[PDB]
XYZ file of C-alpha atoms in Angstrom:
758
model
C 31.100 -13.774 -5.253
C 27.907 -15.729 -5.071
C 26.153 -17.180 -2.048
C 29.608 -18.791 -1.582
C 32.001 -15.988 -0.547
C 31.025 -15.247 2.974
C 32.817 -11.750 2.668
C 30.633 -10.269 -0.099
C 28.097 -7.491 0.363
C 25.511 -9.990 -0.149
C 26.537 -11.857 2.936
C 27.294 -8.644 4.705
C 23.805 -7.004 4.322
C 21.326 -9.522 3.413
C 22.457 -12.512 5.516
C 23.035 -13.329 9.269
C 26.751 -13.791 9.600
C 27.440 -17.462 9.554
C 29.512 -18.754 12.423
C 31.821 -21.911 12.223
C 31.524 -25.558 13.398
C 27.850 -26.649 13.424
C 27.528 -29.514 15.829
C 26.807 -29.624 19.580
C 29.181 -26.735 19.928
C 26.783 -23.935 18.692
C 24.466 -21.888 20.933
C 22.271 -24.653 22.575
C 19.201 -24.216 24.689
C 17.817 -26.789 27.237
C 15.001 -24.818 29.035
C 11.903 -23.024 28.247
C 10.759 -19.428 28.279
C 7.713 -17.352 27.597
C 6.392 -13.878 26.393
C 4.720 -12.054 29.387
C 4.020 -8.444 29.995
C 4.985 -6.548 33.060
C 2.135 -4.109 32.688
C -1.183 -5.931 32.695
C -3.427 -3.339 30.948
C -0.883 -2.213 28.555
C -0.741 -4.722 25.768
C 2.096 -3.493 23.636
C 5.052 -3.995 26.033
C 6.474 -7.397 26.663
C 9.305 -9.163 28.588
C 11.140 -12.581 28.708
C 9.736 -15.087 31.044
C 10.650 -18.527 32.619
C 8.170 -21.501 32.701
C 8.845 -23.539 35.923
C 5.622 -25.347 36.553
C 4.104 -27.190 33.509
C 0.776 -28.528 34.816
C -1.757 -28.650 32.038
C -3.999 -25.927 33.467
C -1.844 -22.922 33.460
C 1.823 -21.773 33.367
C 3.486 -20.405 36.561
C 6.240 -18.526 35.013
C 9.009 -16.625 36.771
C 9.699 -13.134 35.954
C 12.868 -10.879 36.140
C 11.741 -8.694 38.936
C 11.978 -11.860 41.039
C 8.223 -12.302 41.413
C 5.979 -15.175 40.159
C 2.797 -14.429 38.161
C 0.618 -16.976 36.289
C -1.436 -17.570 33.222
C -3.018 -20.379 31.361
C -3.007 -21.767 27.730
C -5.069 -18.964 26.345
C -2.432 -16.142 26.602
C 0.796 -18.115 27.197
C 2.997 -16.587 24.284
C 5.606 -19.267 24.541
C 8.823 -17.949 22.898
C 10.541 -19.762 20.175
C 14.009 -21.470 20.698
C 16.769 -18.936 19.990
C 18.033 -21.007 17.021
C 15.130 -19.375 15.218
C 15.748 -15.907 16.044
C 16.861 -14.594 12.735
C 14.891 -16.951 10.490
C 14.273 -15.549 7.018
C 10.801 -17.294 6.893
C 8.395 -16.834 9.815
C 6.562 -19.854 8.333
C 8.736 -22.190 10.468
C 8.179 -20.556 13.951
C 7.038 -23.356 16.250
C 5.018 -20.513 18.033
C 3.216 -17.776 16.196
C 2.387 -15.364 18.997
C 2.316 -11.584 18.456
C 5.429 -10.915 20.469
C 7.214 -13.859 18.818
C 6.592 -12.481 15.438
C 7.538 -9.053 16.548
C 10.908 -10.211 18.154
C 11.997 -12.028 14.872
C 11.829 -8.828 12.651
C 13.160 -7.042 15.765
C 16.219 -9.127 15.609
C 16.314 -9.035 11.838
C 16.011 -5.115 12.120
C 18.872 -4.604 14.427
C 21.241 -6.388 11.970
C 19.748 -4.222 9.161
C 17.842 -7.070 7.774
C 14.716 -5.225 6.750
C 13.194 -8.141 4.419
C 11.345 -10.966 5.952
C 9.107 -13.658 4.528
C 5.913 -14.198 6.666
C 4.124 -17.136 5.083
C 3.428 -16.248 1.268
C 3.759 -12.555 2.449
C 6.812 -10.345 1.946
C 7.454 -8.186 4.925
C 9.643 -5.052 4.761
C 10.312 -2.549 7.528
C 11.264 1.068 6.730
C 14.919 1.324 7.480
C 15.021 5.247 7.392
C 18.707 4.742 6.368
C 20.869 3.971 3.412
C 21.354 0.127 2.937
C 23.493 -0.573 -0.211
C 21.682 -3.588 -1.551
C 20.226 -1.884 -4.690
C 23.197 -2.000 -6.970
C 23.712 -3.553 -10.257
C 25.860 -6.175 -8.724
C 23.018 -7.065 -6.511
C 20.614 -7.544 -9.434
C 22.874 -9.964 -11.122
C 22.939 -12.095 -7.979
C 19.195 -12.589 -7.834
C 18.703 -13.603 -11.436
C 17.299 -17.165 -11.852
C 17.213 -17.632 -8.136
C 14.372 -19.168 -6.006
C 12.720 -17.996 -2.817
C 14.392 -20.601 -0.611
C 17.605 -20.493 -2.605
C 18.504 -16.915 -1.545
C 17.841 -14.154 1.114
C 14.625 -12.231 1.396
C 14.512 -9.098 -0.911
C 12.219 -7.308 -3.189
C 14.340 -8.490 -6.122
C 13.646 -12.167 -4.811
C 9.905 -11.704 -5.123
C 10.417 -9.749 -8.448
C 12.468 -12.578 -10.212
C 9.991 -15.242 -8.980
C 7.161 -13.566 -10.617
C 9.078 -13.005 -13.930
C 10.174 -16.641 -13.981
C 6.569 -17.934 -13.310
C 5.369 -15.818 -16.265
C 7.863 -17.499 -18.593
C 7.204 -20.997 -17.172
C 3.590 -21.102 -16.295
C 2.928 -18.601 -19.174
C 0.384 -16.903 -16.804
C 0.063 -13.245 -15.857
C 1.454 -11.920 -12.409
C 0.737 -9.162 -9.997
C 2.292 -7.524 -7.156
C 0.241 -6.136 -4.203
C 2.542 -3.367 -2.272
C 0.516 -1.848 0.516
C 0.780 -0.187 3.834
C 0.647 3.198 5.656
C 2.008 6.166 3.699
C 5.628 6.599 4.051
C 6.380 3.045 5.057
C 8.475 1.777 2.271
C 6.279 1.586 -0.663
C 6.644 3.709 -3.827
C 10.280 2.992 -3.276
C 9.745 -0.766 -3.324
C 7.626 -0.597 -6.457
C 10.451 1.646 -8.025
C 12.787 -1.190 -7.338
C 10.343 -3.727 -8.841
C 10.697 -1.681 -12.006
C 14.327 -1.283 -11.692
C 14.927 -5.082 -11.523
C 12.465 -5.796 -14.441
C 14.215 -3.157 -16.555
C 17.402 -5.316 -16.113
C 16.467 -8.983 -16.295
C 14.111 -8.165 -19.272
C 16.212 -5.360 -20.558
C 16.499 -4.745 -24.427
C 19.950 -3.171 -24.791
C 22.858 -4.425 -26.703
C 25.349 -4.383 -23.816
C 24.105 -3.020 -20.422
C 21.519 -0.237 -20.497
C 18.235 0.804 -21.933
C 16.813 0.592 -25.384
C 15.404 3.976 -25.347
C 11.901 2.463 -24.786
C 13.076 1.340 -21.267
C 14.114 4.889 -20.371
C 10.709 6.100 -21.257
C 9.329 3.887 -18.746
C 12.156 4.587 -16.218
C 11.402 8.434 -16.801
C 7.735 8.322 -16.615
C 8.305 8.221 -12.836
C 10.004 11.613 -12.049
C 7.158 13.358 -13.865
C 4.365 11.689 -11.778
C 6.168 12.375 -8.551
C 6.487 16.072 -9.348
C 2.725 16.404 -9.442
C 1.829 13.508 -7.271
C 4.217 14.041 -4.276
C 4.761 16.329 -1.463
C 6.188 16.539 2.004
C 3.850 15.507 5.036
C 4.085 14.284 8.532
C 4.837 10.837 7.410
C 7.405 11.242 4.632
C 9.425 13.963 2.725
C 8.109 12.446 -0.511
C 4.789 10.860 0.180
C 2.496 9.618 -2.503
C -0.870 11.389 -2.759
C -2.409 8.887 -5.338
C -2.616 5.202 -5.799
C -1.629 3.576 -8.973
C -1.624 0.355 -10.935
C 1.359 -0.068 -13.295
C 1.221 -2.704 -15.828
C 4.490 -3.780 -17.328
C 3.829 -5.577 -20.699
C 6.039 -8.054 -22.476
C 6.250 -10.236 -25.688
C 6.352 -13.894 -25.845
C 10.216 -14.057 -25.849
C 10.088 -12.325 -22.407
C 11.189 -8.800 -23.527
C 9.685 -5.642 -22.058
C 7.675 -4.173 -24.890
C 5.679 -1.522 -23.102
C 3.804 -0.269 -19.976
C 0.483 1.493 -18.893
C -0.222 3.553 -15.848
C -3.513 3.773 -13.825
C -4.402 6.479 -11.406
C -6.661 6.662 -8.417
C -7.896 9.016 -5.605
C -5.539 12.013 -6.288
C -5.504 14.342 -3.275
C -7.137 17.352 -4.868
C -7.360 19.363 -1.600
C -3.627 19.679 -1.030
C -3.400 22.193 -3.904
C -5.603 24.684 -2.130
C -4.749 23.711 1.346
C -1.601 22.391 2.799
C -1.340 21.385 6.487
C 1.080 22.548 9.091
C 4.605 21.407 8.755
C 3.645 20.022 5.347
C 3.978 21.655 1.930
C 2.209 21.723 -1.530
C 3.075 19.501 -4.584
C 6.695 19.600 -5.529
C 5.923 20.784 -9.200
C 5.080 24.358 -7.846
C 8.513 24.793 -5.955
C 10.620 23.096 -8.764
C 9.105 25.719 -11.109
C 9.848 28.822 -9.099
C 13.360 28.004 -8.134
C 13.930 26.335 -11.553
C 12.645 28.727 -14.301
C 15.235 31.091 -15.857
C 15.083 34.878 -15.631
C 12.854 35.560 -18.468
C 10.433 32.716 -17.813
C 9.528 34.196 -14.476
C 8.216 37.518 -15.937
C 6.654 35.651 -18.883
C 4.080 34.108 -16.617
C 4.281 36.876 -13.990
C 5.925 34.966 -11.108
C 7.400 35.844 -7.862
C 8.660 34.397 -4.531
C 7.562 30.878 -3.175
C 6.097 32.649 -0.293
C 4.121 35.495 -1.979
C 1.351 32.902 -3.033
C -1.468 32.180 -0.640
C -1.253 28.518 -1.603
C 2.311 28.260 -0.280
C 2.696 30.486 2.688
C 0.208 29.609 5.540
C 1.573 26.116 5.882
C 4.518 26.892 8.121
C 7.284 25.577 5.700
C 8.727 26.085 2.295
C 12.068 24.670 1.572
C 12.593 21.055 2.664
C 15.574 19.571 4.532
C 17.996 17.492 2.370
C 17.759 18.595 -1.240
C 17.188 21.692 -3.410
C 14.416 22.414 -5.990
C 15.851 24.035 -8.974
C 18.077 21.128 -9.463
C 15.106 18.553 -9.384
C 13.500 20.883 -11.949
C 16.159 19.593 -14.269
C 15.314 16.016 -14.100
C 11.683 17.015 -14.339
C 11.996 18.813 -17.566
C 14.638 16.191 -18.643
C 12.385 13.201 -18.206
C 9.745 15.457 -19.781
C 11.509 15.511 -22.966
C 12.811 11.825 -22.814
C 9.124 10.524 -22.690
C 8.218 13.046 -25.328
C 6.541 16.434 -24.606
C 6.761 19.281 -26.918
C 9.055 22.056 -25.398
C 6.016 24.345 -25.928
C 3.590 21.720 -24.460
C 5.931 21.886 -21.408
C 5.471 25.666 -21.105
C 1.841 25.071 -21.335
C 1.943 22.528 -18.435
C 3.880 25.216 -16.446
C 1.571 28.121 -17.269
C -1.368 26.080 -15.650
C 0.878 25.462 -12.667
C 1.526 29.160 -12.617
C -2.020 30.328 -13.163
C -3.273 28.177 -10.316
C -0.979 30.222 -8.079
C -2.769 33.475 -9.042
C -6.216 32.189 -8.594
C -5.021 31.374 -4.938
C -3.954 35.060 -4.706
C -7.478 36.575 -5.453
C -8.642 37.908 -2.005
C -12.358 38.250 -2.240
C -13.756 41.503 -0.591
C -17.119 42.697 0.716
C -18.984 45.330 -1.243
C -22.633 46.512 -1.414
C -24.543 44.327 1.312
C -24.171 40.766 0.291
C -22.014 39.528 -2.776
C -18.362 40.093 -3.124
C -16.312 42.561 -5.110
C -12.688 42.139 -6.536
C -11.711 45.703 -6.029
C -8.038 44.857 -6.779
C -8.190 43.264 -10.193
C -4.311 42.314 -9.967
C -3.980 38.687 -9.536
C -7.029 37.592 -11.578
C -5.674 39.469 -14.649
C -2.314 37.573 -14.357
C -4.232 34.421 -13.786
C -6.373 35.099 -16.886
C -3.240 36.011 -18.853
C -1.572 32.483 -18.765
C -4.756 30.710 -19.373
C -6.115 32.454 -22.310
C -9.427 33.311 -21.190
C -11.583 36.503 -21.167
C -10.840 38.073 -17.725
C -14.151 40.036 -18.036
C -16.266 37.053 -18.443
C -14.098 35.049 -16.090
C -14.699 37.909 -13.554
C -18.439 37.606 -13.201
C -18.491 33.827 -14.157
C -16.918 33.455 -10.778
C -19.111 35.875 -8.731
C -22.153 35.927 -10.891
C -22.967 32.422 -12.276
C -26.310 31.503 -13.740
C -28.627 28.946 -12.097
C -31.566 26.741 -13.532
C -34.150 27.345 -10.935
C -37.297 26.224 -12.506
C -37.328 27.257 -16.110
C -35.514 30.751 -15.415
C -31.803 31.046 -15.994
C -30.640 33.832 -13.825
C -27.145 35.360 -13.026
C -26.475 35.306 -9.398
C -24.043 37.537 -7.056
C -22.567 35.204 -4.440
C -21.141 36.127 -0.847
C -17.348 35.825 -0.146
C -17.663 32.304 1.225
C -19.348 30.901 -2.024
C -17.436 33.184 -4.342
C -14.187 31.746 -2.696
C -15.381 28.154 -2.647
C -16.181 28.259 -6.287
C -12.671 29.574 -6.810
C -10.959 26.522 -5.081
C -13.403 24.176 -6.899
C -11.977 25.728 -10.198
C -8.514 25.216 -9.061
C -8.887 21.550 -8.043
C -10.621 20.568 -11.136
C -7.862 22.070 -13.228
C -4.988 20.315 -11.444
C -6.953 17.131 -11.165
C -7.458 17.265 -14.922
C -3.964 18.217 -15.852
C -2.599 15.343 -13.769
C -5.410 13.224 -15.613
C -4.015 14.603 -18.873
C -0.311 13.810 -18.032
C -0.887 9.988 -17.398
C -3.079 10.079 -20.640
C -0.226 11.233 -22.857
C 2.108 8.895 -21.210
C 0.058 5.895 -21.851
C -0.216 6.504 -25.708
C 3.549 6.707 -25.680
C 4.028 3.515 -23.693
C 0.806 1.221 -23.813
C 0.554 -1.284 -26.673
C -1.753 -3.128 -28.892
C -0.775 -6.712 -28.732
C 0.507 -7.185 -25.223
C 1.538 -10.788 -24.719
C 1.839 -11.056 -20.884
C 2.032 -8.471 -18.080
C 3.312 -8.036 -14.538
C 1.239 -5.532 -12.759
C 2.390 -3.491 -9.683
C -0.428 -2.181 -7.404
C 0.738 0.551 -5.186
C -1.862 1.770 -2.592
C -2.346 2.263 1.250
C -4.119 -0.218 3.349
C -6.647 0.488 6.058
C -5.947 3.873 7.934
C -7.745 5.473 10.871
C -7.148 9.218 11.023
C -8.395 11.811 13.505
C -11.375 12.719 11.270
C -12.479 10.076 8.712
C -14.224 11.467 5.579
C -15.464 10.180 2.269
C -12.085 9.483 0.751
C -11.256 7.080 3.664
C -14.593 5.106 3.022
C -13.351 4.288 -0.538
C -9.811 2.844 0.313
C -11.159 0.907 3.353
C -13.735 -0.311 0.722
C -10.911 -1.378 -1.562
C -9.025 -2.983 1.301
C -12.084 -5.060 2.160
C -11.761 -6.540 -1.222
C -8.057 -7.021 -1.473
C -7.962 -8.636 1.991
C -10.967 -10.863 0.716
C -8.808 -11.453 -2.469
C -5.997 -12.808 -0.155
C -8.302 -15.084 2.005
C -9.869 -16.415 -0.994
C -6.761 -17.038 -3.049
C -5.616 -19.072 0.040
C -8.529 -21.559 -0.434
C -7.458 -22.445 -3.950
C -3.908 -23.391 -3.127
C -4.661 -24.846 0.361
C -7.044 -27.363 -1.260
C -4.314 -28.008 -4.030
C -1.496 -29.393 -1.845
C -4.395 -31.155 0.029
C -4.581 -33.544 -2.938
C -1.019 -34.914 -3.600
C -0.690 -36.203 -0.016
C -2.430 -39.564 -0.619
C -4.693 -38.691 2.517
C -6.760 -35.803 1.746
C -7.871 -33.181 4.351
C -11.599 -32.581 5.394
C -13.258 -30.049 3.117
C -13.019 -26.769 4.951
C -14.736 -23.474 3.864
C -14.748 -19.831 4.714
C -17.578 -17.894 3.133
C -15.546 -14.892 4.222
C -17.062 -12.686 6.845
C -15.870 -9.876 4.743
C -18.842 -9.973 2.447
C -21.101 -8.308 5.180
C -19.092 -5.138 5.252
C -18.954 -5.043 1.493
C -22.759 -5.286 1.302
C -23.058 -2.545 3.714
C -21.138 -0.302 1.483
C -21.878 -1.054 -2.277
C -24.891 -3.397 -1.904
C -27.965 -2.858 -4.155
C -30.802 -4.421 -2.411
C -31.107 -3.761 0.168
C -29.416 -0.431 -0.599
C -25.939 0.180 0.969
C -24.100 3.426 1.947
C -22.919 4.164 -1.565
C -26.402 3.564 -2.776
C -28.447 5.751 -0.457
C -25.836 8.502 -0.865
C -26.405 8.251 -4.614
C -30.050 8.813 -4.400
C -29.422 11.696 -2.137
C -27.226 13.575 -4.571
C -29.627 13.666 -7.606
C -31.730 16.285 -5.823
C -30.720 19.897 -6.035
C -31.664 20.330 -2.474
C -30.855 17.620 -0.001
C -28.514 18.299 2.976
C -25.900 16.576 5.053
C -28.228 16.235 7.914
C -30.836 14.223 5.995
C -28.163 12.230 4.433
C -27.158 10.655 7.710
C -30.881 10.672 8.758
C -31.248 8.204 5.969
C -28.328 5.845 6.900
C -29.373 5.775 10.560
C -32.973 4.720 9.695
C -31.596 1.991 7.396
C -28.784 0.379 9.335
C -28.927 1.380 13.046
C -29.882 -1.693 15.121
C -30.567 -3.416 11.701
C -27.064 -4.043 10.669
C -24.196 -5.781 12.433
C -21.512 -3.851 10.659
C -23.262 -0.467 11.474
C -23.358 1.497 14.521
C -24.871 4.805 15.498
C -22.900 7.120 17.725
C -24.170 7.859 21.226
C -23.727 11.702 21.457
C -22.443 12.370 17.974
C -25.020 13.840 15.448
C -23.193 13.669 12.303
C -21.193 10.398 12.352
C -21.592 6.628 11.948
C -19.315 3.639 12.527
C -18.448 0.685 10.140
C -16.861 -2.404 11.431
C -14.066 -3.184 9.086
C -11.694 -6.259 8.706
C -9.143 -4.164 10.906
C -11.790 -2.710 13.217
C -14.362 0.073 13.601
C -13.889 3.395 11.797
C -15.985 6.433 12.652
C -16.916 8.491 9.541
C -17.963 12.130 9.452
C -20.545 13.178 7.168
C -20.145 16.947 6.161
C -19.501 17.565 2.547
C -20.101 14.035 1.227
C -23.176 15.133 -0.529
C -21.133 18.037 -2.435
C -17.911 15.941 -3.259
C -20.047 12.917 -4.466
C -20.901 15.078 -7.568
C -17.887 17.438 -7.935
C -19.924 20.346 -9.051
C -18.527 23.060 -11.285
C -20.729 25.962 -12.176
C -21.395 25.649 -15.886
C -20.343 29.365 -16.327
C -16.831 28.622 -15.208
C -16.766 25.499 -17.538
C -17.981 27.209 -20.670
C -15.637 30.185 -19.730
C -12.608 28.020 -20.088
C -14.181 25.734 -22.698
C -12.953 28.302 -25.335
C -9.534 29.530 -24.456
C -6.250 30.412 -26.160
C -4.046 27.395 -25.665
C -3.383 23.902 -26.996
C -3.221 22.019 -23.648
C -5.813 23.791 -21.261
C -8.626 23.145 -23.776
C -8.644 19.383 -24.180
C -9.084 19.469 -20.379
C -12.664 21.240 -20.905
C -13.431 20.139 -24.347
C -13.044 16.326 -24.259
C -15.390 14.231 -22.369
C -12.688 11.595 -21.843
C -11.141 14.131 -19.436
C -13.934 16.492 -18.382
C -16.938 14.138 -17.989
C -18.016 10.703 -16.869
C -19.972 7.791 -18.226
C -23.241 8.696 -19.999
C -26.361 6.744 -18.758
C -29.750 8.182 -18.031
C -29.475 11.476 -16.441
C -26.302 13.575 -17.084
C -23.155 11.423 -16.199
C -22.424 9.521 -13.042
C -21.429 10.131 -9.404
C -17.907 10.211 -8.079
C -18.796 7.086 -5.987
C -20.315 5.204 -8.836
C -17.208 5.710 -10.959
C -15.062 4.367 -8.057
C -17.017 1.324 -7.549
C -16.837 0.645 -11.063
C -13.040 1.163 -11.466
C -12.328 -0.935 -8.388
C -14.557 -3.784 -9.787
C -12.490 -3.463 -12.972
C -9.310 -3.579 -10.992
C -10.272 -6.907 -9.417
C -11.434 -8.363 -12.772
C -7.756 -8.000 -13.856
C -6.362 -9.207 -10.387
C -8.455 -12.270 -10.627
C -6.770 -13.090 -13.903
C -3.274 -12.934 -12.482
C -1.079 -14.868 -10.063
C -0.487 -12.576 -7.029
C 2.436 -11.864 -4.712
C 1.973 -9.821 -1.572
C 4.353 -7.212 -0.161
C 3.357 -5.496 3.218
C 5.459 -2.276 3.943
C 5.997 -1.306 7.517
C 7.172 1.834 9.528
C 9.298 1.417 12.696
C 8.529 4.986 14.240
C 6.766 8.237 13.574
C 9.788 10.261 13.893
C 11.583 9.025 10.635
C 14.666 7.766 12.642
C 16.858 4.605 12.210
C 17.420 2.170 15.083
C 13.952 2.961 16.478
C 11.564 0.025 16.685
C 8.496 1.188 18.670
C 6.520 -1.645 20.129
C 3.147 0.260 20.087
C 3.595 1.580 16.579
C 5.145 -1.613 14.996
C 2.759 -4.082 16.907
C -0.545 -2.550 16.160
C 0.738 -2.456 12.482
C 0.845 -6.187 12.317
C -2.903 -6.250 12.971
C -3.733 -3.227 10.785
C -2.633 -5.772 8.158
C -2.962 -9.385 9.352
C 0.225 -10.771 7.756
C 0.263 -13.049 10.901
C -3.235 -14.350 10.541
C -2.517 -15.331 7.036
C -0.484 -18.290 8.463
C -2.553 -18.891 11.463
C -5.053 -20.507 9.134
C -2.513 -23.024 8.097
C -1.882 -23.676 11.648
C -4.966 -25.924 11.511
C -2.829 -28.298 9.742
C 0.825 -27.622 9.760
C 2.590 -24.232 10.842
C 5.973 -25.560 9.802
C 5.628 -24.581 6.118
C 8.839 -25.224 4.274
C 10.210 -27.548 1.644
C 9.541 -31.312 1.642
C 11.260 -33.403 4.283
C 14.538 -32.085 5.803
C 14.583 -34.266 8.927
C 15.620 -36.699 6.264
C 18.532 -34.390 4.980
C 19.524 -32.479 7.935
C 19.844 -34.439 11.146
C 21.476 -37.861 11.654
C 23.505 -37.924 14.799
C 20.472 -38.810 16.995
C 20.569 -41.799 19.363
C 19.528 -45.296 18.086
C 16.394 -44.380 16.024
C 16.771 -43.007 12.442
C 19.848 -43.451 10.307
C 21.626 -40.786 8.299
C 20.924 -42.100 4.677
C 17.873 -44.095 3.972
C 15.925 -44.738 0.645
C 13.204 -42.172 -0.041
C 12.784 -38.869 1.576
C 9.328 -39.618 2.754
C 9.805 -42.094 5.531
C 13.717 -41.907 5.452
C 13.383 -40.635 8.987
C 10.561 -43.033 10.009
C 11.495 -43.198 13.762
C 12.455 -40.006 15.431
C 9.036 -38.642 14.912
C 6.523 -41.498 15.342
C 7.716 -44.275 17.865
C 8.532 -41.306 20.118
C 4.946 -40.850 21.454
C 3.321 -40.254 18.055
C 0.771 -41.612 15.623
C -1.465 -40.544 12.873
C -1.618 -37.114 14.398
C 0.903 -34.442 13.109
C 2.066 -33.941 9.573
C -0.259 -35.288 7.029
C 2.263 -37.393 4.954
C 0.821 -40.512 3.369
C 3.018 -41.542 0.256
C 3.150 -38.484 -2.049
C 4.184 -35.036 -0.750
C 3.559 -32.586 2.001
C 4.988 -29.902 4.244
C 6.169 -30.402 7.952
C 4.720 -29.791 11.385
C 6.593 -28.131 14.251
C 4.057 -27.216 16.873
C 5.078 -29.757 19.522
C 8.672 -30.025 18.079
C 10.663 -29.364 21.264
C 10.596 -32.821 23.024
C 12.328 -34.481 20.210
C 15.534 -32.183 20.486
C 17.036 -29.542 22.761
C 19.532 -31.485 24.981
C 22.464 -33.958 24.061
C 22.136 -34.926 20.407
């Protein structure tokens, strides 16, 4: 049942059902169409045309409503011949317009074919349905297969990365990106699944204990890193760089996980129709009778951190059941049964801190009249409720050389409480991953295949400091792609006898990067850092600086017309308006030293290494105190790229067909503007300067042969074996760059040579 049997699930679900015959009796076209739009202003809605007057000025195409508009060779989105509809590689489409590219994966999608190669890119549209293509029988089919040797699948790009590591003896990397809830996380899971198979270490068919530890380090991270949102009922609230390490033989020997940008806010505040992290709900419905009273728990709605968001129980699964796999995977990877209670006690404590309703007392300054929830909160932790009490409403400050206790109003006595909660969860999660690495990362890793999982550019309603970071990361990854293209493009420029004219891109992406992290002149991240060192500077002066540095003095910068708090940065994808607000606070992650030294000596074995160890409770020591959140981010990002540059990358781009989570719903607007949020199309357009028919070597030699007296069927060398149907037919040095060595083909004008009778 290989590529041979046409009645296998492989042919059924991953292939376009293959007719019979082949010759002049298969769908044939003898005319020409075009992609126009019925609505002039509305861009994302197109329709089939008809081209009736050629004249090299414009195209006077017919319509379907009977009328006859016009257009020239600047917008004419000439549609590809129908024999192309369905192609697995868009790298062959004679025309590369926006609608053309949308139509292909549109046809692919209606046939449940969600994977499609676009150049060196791997495109995958979220099916919102159960396609049975992830079986063990499926994995065995991709083993030892080549890209052009099989159909497009996450397994195809996985195997290829694995084979290259064994052959070229180089390191590999996968870059899976896209909007949240668009396919990723799941794709990256399939990558690990496949690799656990081909490079598995079990006698007969299974895991070798080690493999499971890896396969099980996943349920845990989703329990703390996932939650239901408006995009997906699982949606990842963090980025991650997973490194799968091997030995020389090609056997999986260990792995290591890297974490980024955890959504600390979700803990304290979930949005409408959304819910908090899974771990909370799995605990409540999961913990047995005695465990509930042990930590003083009650209903999943009697907690201020889980009730205001108008939703609790999700539609499709339970929670107590998935709490089984959580504690199950927790003891497979290795976590003391007591260390697991410790983890839960914090998850439980967090709930009670959210239940501390601060009330007003004598004039300003709050009062916790009802010491009910705090006591319980302080119980599970192991801290002094008395000192915790006033360390949260009467912290000391170092104003001058005086160190004075200070009563706080409700707003600031509540903010400090939420800041305490975030810090805890953000460190616990930072502790989880840490324990997992020491159980899976290694000492003498031979080679590794890395899987970067993070979202690309994203324009929300209100962009804040966390959006600046990822958009800053994307600017580099997108620069990494365009740069990687040079190297290769130049290579196959060499073995063609005739070599192409040196061509450069200095990459206009460097400008935006300078605007963000530049040193001299200072960039956003720089000016922001100088503004944070002062125990004084506000959010007004913060933006006052930027506007005085970049307004009318920087191309990528823009000052809003009527807005008094924002600024716009022109990225690769477009302009994004950023709101200032609490950047000055979140850039330092302040935590009143009293709450720090309050927890720093508690009764527990887990909650203490969170406050006592600088590897988890602090940042790099240089000059004054430790560094800023933005400083650490620039550093880690830079480190990420250092590794990436050492590897041979593969690019996967996830897509969502609709904002409703429905199958068979391919929205033009939604899907179309998503092919530009990413550029998977422009990736090929750069090769269009040479050849846009990218495929293997020469096929006109080994495909056609019936054509009228011109080229024979079998000639001597695949280079000039067809030395007539593509030259003496109105051609000369001006098409495909084939001298005497190697090349790829050119199909731009390909339409006059074939389309009628043989």
